[PDB]
Amino acid sequence: GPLGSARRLYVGNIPFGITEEAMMDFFNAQMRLGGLTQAPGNPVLAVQINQDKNFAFLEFRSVDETTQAMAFDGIIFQGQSLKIRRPHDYQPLPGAHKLFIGGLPNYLNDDQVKELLTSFGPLKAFNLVKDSATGLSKGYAFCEYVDINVTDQAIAGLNGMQLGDKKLLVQRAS
Amino acid sequence: LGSARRLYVGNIPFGITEEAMMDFFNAQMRLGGLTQAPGNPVLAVQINQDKNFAFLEFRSVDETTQAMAFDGIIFQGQSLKIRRPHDYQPLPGAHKLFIGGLPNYLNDDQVKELLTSFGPLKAFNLVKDSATGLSKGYAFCEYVDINVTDQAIAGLNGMQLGDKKLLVQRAS
């Protein structure tokens, strides 16, 4: 980051004694059969394995093909379900997955509204909108999760749901 | 792996040397086109003359698998019995163990001390944060004798270890 790590992926739970070359051939074949490549040839350029800790990193030829490959999370390779993830250095650009939260009781303070949200996971941003003259809540807020996969989970768990005698609205801010 | 590069050879004739047997198998492999590079696939041979058997050791896993087709092959008038070692693992990593719920202050050798009360280990690693160098509270291992695995699971899984409860299961 901010622009680094855009063309690599973490692979965990790899099969025992598997070679770099065989893992490369496996992923290149799946990209092709699954229709995920965007040009003739092989998207995966190189594979590096850590034998002792049982994981790999893949290196891709393009930014968009790296992103498509994430669809393979869970794929079974020699009896093993593979865990596919972004590198830890990889971050989306700011505000990319911001949420609007509305329909909140306006007698609730910031920490009480945060406590509903952090039940799904840690936040990296949060604000509850207040009238500046009085400091009183307007009953709506914005947030952003550290992990971006938690976003769909909070939406599915909270949107349209009863809170008091109001139905909460939880959706993407743009 | 290691036992994935050996074969048992029985019914061996009296008087045969380790070098005569090494030459025979290298010659058979080349003749049947079963080698996957230039050179000789058999690195070493050890013979027990009192019990009429030998072990072969190969340079690769796939050449070892290939030589399995030599069961019944004639050497000095006699048919040889070719088999896998008794501790060969068809599905490797099957007995690798996950150890979770470890106190986060314990170092590698302290965790191994817990595990080697059941027997010697062939593999071990404690997972640490690369940034700080600090234990994440879990490890992996394999025993030299795979039959101890379940006796380690029975001994440790669910045991209170200070402030936390251990999970010991096959990593699978």
PDB file of C-alpha atoms in Angstrom, chain A residues 33-173:
ATOM      1  CA  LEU A  33     -11.778 -23.165 -17.462  1.00  0.00           C
ATOM      2  CA  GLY A  34     -13.714 -20.797 -15.150  1.00  0.00           C
ATOM      3  CA  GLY A  35     -13.638 -17.877 -17.625  1.00  0.00           C
ATOM      4  CA  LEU A  36     -11.759 -15.487 -15.296  1.00  0.00           C
ATOM      5  CA  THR A  37      -8.900 -14.430 -17.605  1.00  0.00           C
ATOM      6  CA  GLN A  38      -9.087 -11.242 -19.670  1.00  0.00           C
ATOM      7  CA  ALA A  39      -6.561 -12.062 -22.409  1.00  0.00           C
ATOM      8  CA  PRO A  40      -4.977 -15.063 -24.107  1.00  0.00           C
ATOM      9  CA  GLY A  41      -2.342 -16.825 -21.989  1.00  0.00           C
ATOM     10  CA  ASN A  42      -1.518 -17.468 -18.369  1.00  0.00           C
ATOM     11  CA  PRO A  43      -2.453 -14.929 -15.616  1.00  0.00           C
ATOM     12  CA  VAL A  44      -0.232 -16.393 -12.851  1.00  0.00           C
ATOM     13  CA  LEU A  45       3.435 -15.509 -13.447  1.00  0.00           C
ATOM     14  CA  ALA A  46       5.089 -17.112 -10.406  1.00  0.00           C
ATOM     15  CA  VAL A  47       4.378 -18.967  -7.155  1.00  0.00           C
ATOM     16  CA  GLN A  48       6.469 -18.909  -3.936  1.00  0.00           C
ATOM     17  CA  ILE A  49       6.017 -21.594  -1.248  1.00  0.00           C
ATOM     18  CA  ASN A  50       6.824 -21.632   2.468  1.00  0.00           C
ATOM     19  CA  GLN A  51       7.087 -25.379   3.171  1.00  0.00           C
ATOM     20  CA  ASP A  52       7.445 -25.174   6.953  1.00  0.00           C
ATOM     21  CA  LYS A  53       4.421 -22.895   7.520  1.00  0.00           C
ATOM     22  CA  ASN A  54       2.363 -24.413   4.670  1.00  0.00           C
ATOM     23  CA  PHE A  55       1.364 -21.367   2.589  1.00  0.00           C
ATOM     24  CA  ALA A  56       2.021 -19.731  -0.796  1.00  0.00           C
ATOM     25  CA  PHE A  57       1.899 -16.369  -2.534  1.00  0.00           C
ATOM     26  CA  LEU A  58       0.799 -16.113  -6.195  1.00  0.00           C
ATOM     27  CA  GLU A  59       1.998 -13.284  -8.510  1.00  0.00           C
ATOM     28  CA  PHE A  60      -0.348 -12.135 -11.327  1.00  0.00           C
ATOM     29  CA  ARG A  61       0.286 -10.312 -14.651  1.00  0.00           C
ATOM     30  CA  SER A  62      -2.581  -7.810 -14.082  1.00  0.00           C
ATOM     31  CA  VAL A  63      -4.495  -5.996 -11.319  1.00  0.00           C
ATOM     32  CA  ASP A  64      -8.025  -7.103 -12.389  1.00  0.00           C
ATOM     33  CA  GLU A  65      -7.139 -10.819 -12.755  1.00  0.00           C
ATOM     34  CA  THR A  66      -5.797 -10.871  -9.176  1.00  0.00           C
ATOM     35  CA  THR A  67      -9.217  -9.642  -8.031  1.00  0.00           C
ATOM     36  CA  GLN A  68     -11.132 -12.234 -10.061  1.00  0.00           C
ATOM     37  CA  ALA A  69      -9.041 -15.095  -8.594  1.00  0.00           C
ATOM     38  CA  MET A  70     -10.508 -14.429  -5.151  1.00  0.00           C
ATOM     39  CA  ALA A  71     -13.640 -16.228  -6.375  1.00  0.00           C
ATOM     40  CA  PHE A  72     -11.623 -19.474  -5.918  1.00  0.00           C
ATOM     41  CA  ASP A  73     -11.616 -19.165  -2.091  1.00  0.00           C
ATOM     42  CA  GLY A  74     -12.437 -22.673  -0.781  1.00  0.00           C
ATOM     43  CA  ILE A  75     -11.572 -24.575  -3.991  1.00  0.00           C
ATOM     44  CA  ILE A  76     -10.449 -28.163  -3.313  1.00  0.00           C
ATOM     45  CA  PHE A  77      -6.930 -29.000  -4.500  1.00  0.00           C
ATOM     46  CA  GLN A  78      -5.654 -32.536  -3.772  1.00  0.00           C
ATOM     47  CA  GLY A  79      -8.282 -33.003  -1.035  1.00  0.00           C
ATOM     48  CA  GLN A  80      -7.575 -29.624   0.639  1.00  0.00           C
ATOM     49  CA  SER A  81      -9.860 -26.571   0.776  1.00  0.00           C
ATOM     50  CA  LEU A  82      -7.676 -23.554  -0.111  1.00  0.00           C
ATOM     51  CA  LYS A  83      -7.893 -20.266   1.839  1.00  0.00           C
ATOM     52  CA  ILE A  84      -7.368 -17.349  -0.594  1.00  0.00           C
ATOM     53  CA  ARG A  85      -6.870 -13.846   0.836  1.00  0.00           C
ATOM     54  CA  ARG A  86      -5.455 -10.424   0.057  1.00  0.00           C
ATOM     55  CA  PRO A  87      -1.921  -9.704   1.309  1.00  0.00           C
ATOM     56  CA  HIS A  88      -1.853  -7.908   4.691  1.00  0.00           C
ATOM     57  CA  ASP A  89      -0.063  -4.921   3.092  1.00  0.00           C
ATOM     58  CA  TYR A  90      -3.016  -4.497   0.666  1.00  0.00           C
ATOM     59  CA  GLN A  91      -5.612  -1.824   1.538  1.00  0.00           C
ATOM     60  CA  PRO A  92      -8.572  -0.467  -0.439  1.00  0.00           C
ATOM     61  CA  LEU A  93      -8.616   3.266  -1.130  1.00  0.00           C
ATOM     62  CA  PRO A  94     -10.293   5.304   1.668  1.00  0.00           C
ATOM     63  CA  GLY A  95     -14.112   5.477   1.805  1.00  0.00           C
ATOM     64  CA  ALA A  96     -14.423   2.596  -0.667  1.00  0.00           C
ATOM     65  CA  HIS A  97     -16.874   0.602   1.563  1.00  0.00           C
ATOM     66  CA  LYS A  98     -18.514   3.299   3.745  1.00  0.00           C
ATOM     67  CA  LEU A  99     -21.934   2.561   5.252  1.00  0.00           C
ATOM     68  CA  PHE A 100     -24.922   4.769   6.069  1.00  0.00           C
ATOM     69  CA  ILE A 101     -26.848   3.817   9.240  1.00  0.00           C
ATOM     70  CA  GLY A 102     -30.249   5.462   9.825  1.00  0.00           C
ATOM     71  CA  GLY A 103     -33.382   5.059  11.940  1.00  0.00           C
ATOM     72  CA  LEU A 104     -31.464   5.145  15.251  1.00  0.00           C
ATOM     73  CA  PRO A 105     -33.170   6.262  18.492  1.00  0.00           C
ATOM     74  CA  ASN A 106     -31.837   9.811  18.968  1.00  0.00           C
ATOM     75  CA  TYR A 107     -31.384   9.514  22.749  1.00  0.00           C
ATOM     76  CA  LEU A 108     -28.461   7.072  22.156  1.00  0.00           C
ATOM     77  CA  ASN A 109     -24.896   8.467  22.378  1.00  0.00           C
ATOM     78  CA  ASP A 110     -21.867   7.592  20.197  1.00  0.00           C
ATOM     79  CA  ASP A 111     -20.587   4.655  22.240  1.00  0.00           C
ATOM     80  CA  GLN A 112     -24.034   3.029  22.423  1.00  0.00           C
ATOM     81  CA  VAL A 113     -24.391   3.170  18.606  1.00  0.00           C
ATOM     82  CA  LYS A 114     -20.783   1.913  18.094  1.00  0.00           C
ATOM     83  CA  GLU A 115     -21.574  -1.128  20.300  1.00  0.00           C
ATOM     84  CA  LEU A 116     -24.236  -2.376  17.860  1.00  0.00           C
ATOM     85  CA  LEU A 117     -21.793  -1.961  14.946  1.00  0.00           C
ATOM     86  CA  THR A 118     -18.639  -3.499  16.461  1.00  0.00           C
ATOM     87  CA  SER A 119     -20.556  -6.760  17.216  1.00  0.00           C
ATOM     88  CA  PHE A 120     -19.866  -7.698  13.565  1.00  0.00           C
ATOM     89  CA  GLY A 121     -16.208  -6.570  13.682  1.00  0.00           C
ATOM     90  CA  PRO A 122     -13.752  -3.727  14.352  1.00  0.00           C
ATOM     91  CA  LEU A 123     -14.314  -0.308  12.729  1.00  0.00           C
ATOM     92  CA  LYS A 124     -11.624   1.912  11.179  1.00  0.00           C
ATOM     93  CA  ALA A 125     -13.998   4.908  10.856  1.00  0.00           C
ATOM     94  CA  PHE A 126     -17.184   6.093  12.587  1.00  0.00           C
ATOM     95  CA  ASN A 127     -19.277   9.258  12.955  1.00  0.00           C
ATOM     96  CA  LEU A 128     -22.726   9.948  14.453  1.00  0.00           C
ATOM     97  CA  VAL A 129     -24.248  13.150  13.057  1.00  0.00           C
ATOM     98  CA  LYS A 130     -25.328  15.680  15.682  1.00  0.00           C
ATOM     99  CA  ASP A 131     -26.847  19.147  15.619  1.00  0.00           C
ATOM    100  CA  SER A 132     -23.845  21.345  16.368  1.00  0.00           C
ATOM    101  CA  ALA A 133     -25.722  24.024  18.354  1.00  0.00           C
ATOM    102  CA  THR A 134     -27.231  21.527  20.837  1.00  0.00           C
ATOM    103  CA  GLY A 135     -24.940  18.490  20.387  1.00  0.00           C
ATOM    104  CA  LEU A 136     -28.044  16.291  19.980  1.00  0.00           C
ATOM    105  CA  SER A 137     -28.081  13.227  17.694  1.00  0.00           C
ATOM    106  CA  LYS A 138     -29.903  13.464  14.326  1.00  0.00           C
ATOM    107  CA  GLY A 139     -30.403   9.699  14.462  1.00  0.00           C
ATOM    108  CA  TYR A 140     -28.044   8.658  11.659  1.00  0.00           C
ATOM    109  CA  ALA A 141     -24.398   7.677  11.320  1.00  0.00           C
ATOM    110  CA  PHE A 142     -21.624   6.554   8.965  1.00  0.00           C
ATOM    111  CA  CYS A 143     -18.992   3.856   9.479  1.00  0.00           C
ATOM    112  CA  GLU A 144     -16.339   1.680   7.811  1.00  0.00           C
ATOM    113  CA  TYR A 145     -15.046  -1.780   8.796  1.00  0.00           C
ATOM    114  CA  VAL A 146     -11.343  -2.762   9.091  1.00  0.00           C
ATOM    115  CA  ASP A 147     -12.192  -5.963   7.235  1.00  0.00           C
ATOM    116  CA  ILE A 148     -14.215  -5.133   4.100  1.00  0.00           C
ATOM    117  CA  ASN A 149     -15.952  -8.541   3.988  1.00  0.00           C
ATOM    118  CA  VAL A 150     -17.722  -7.665   7.273  1.00  0.00           C
ATOM    119  CA  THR A 151     -19.667  -4.931   5.416  1.00  0.00           C
ATOM    120  CA  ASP A 152     -22.171  -7.286   3.696  1.00  0.00           C
ATOM    121  CA  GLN A 153     -22.605  -9.095   7.043  1.00  0.00           C
ATOM    122  CA  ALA A 154     -23.620  -5.928   8.936  1.00  0.00           C
ATOM    123  CA  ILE A 155     -26.039  -5.038   6.126  1.00  0.00           C
ATOM    124  CA  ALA A 156     -27.640  -8.487   6.152  1.00  0.00           C
ATOM    125  CA  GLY A 157     -27.817  -8.502   9.991  1.00  0.00           C
ATOM    126  CA  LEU A 158     -29.166  -4.941  10.552  1.00  0.00           C
ATOM    127  CA  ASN A 159     -30.962  -3.632   7.420  1.00  0.00           C
ATOM    128  CA  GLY A 160     -34.762  -3.682   7.730  1.00  0.00           C
ATOM    129  CA  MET A 161     -34.514  -4.899  11.322  1.00  0.00           C
ATOM    130  CA  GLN A 162     -36.551  -3.748  14.303  1.00  0.00           C
ATOM    131  CA  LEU A 163     -34.872  -1.430  16.818  1.00  0.00           C
ATOM    132  CA  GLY A 164     -37.414   0.074  19.206  1.00  0.00           C
ATOM    133  CA  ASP A 165     -40.411   0.796  16.992  1.00  0.00           C
ATOM    134  CA  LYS A 166     -38.230   1.869  14.021  1.00  0.00           C
ATOM    135  CA  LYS A 167     -36.768  -0.336  11.251  1.00  0.00           C
ATOM    136  CA  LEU A 168     -33.020   0.303  10.819  1.00  0.00           C
ATOM    137  CA  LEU A 169     -31.658   1.246   7.387  1.00  0.00           C
ATOM    138  CA  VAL A 170     -28.151  -0.037   6.685  1.00  0.00           C
ATOM    139  CA  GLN A 171     -26.687   0.315   3.176  1.00  0.00           C
ATOM    140  CA  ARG A 172     -23.627   1.533   1.272  1.00  0.00           C
ATOM    141  CA  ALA A 173     -23.129   5.317   1.475  1.00  0.00           C
TER     142      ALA A 173
END
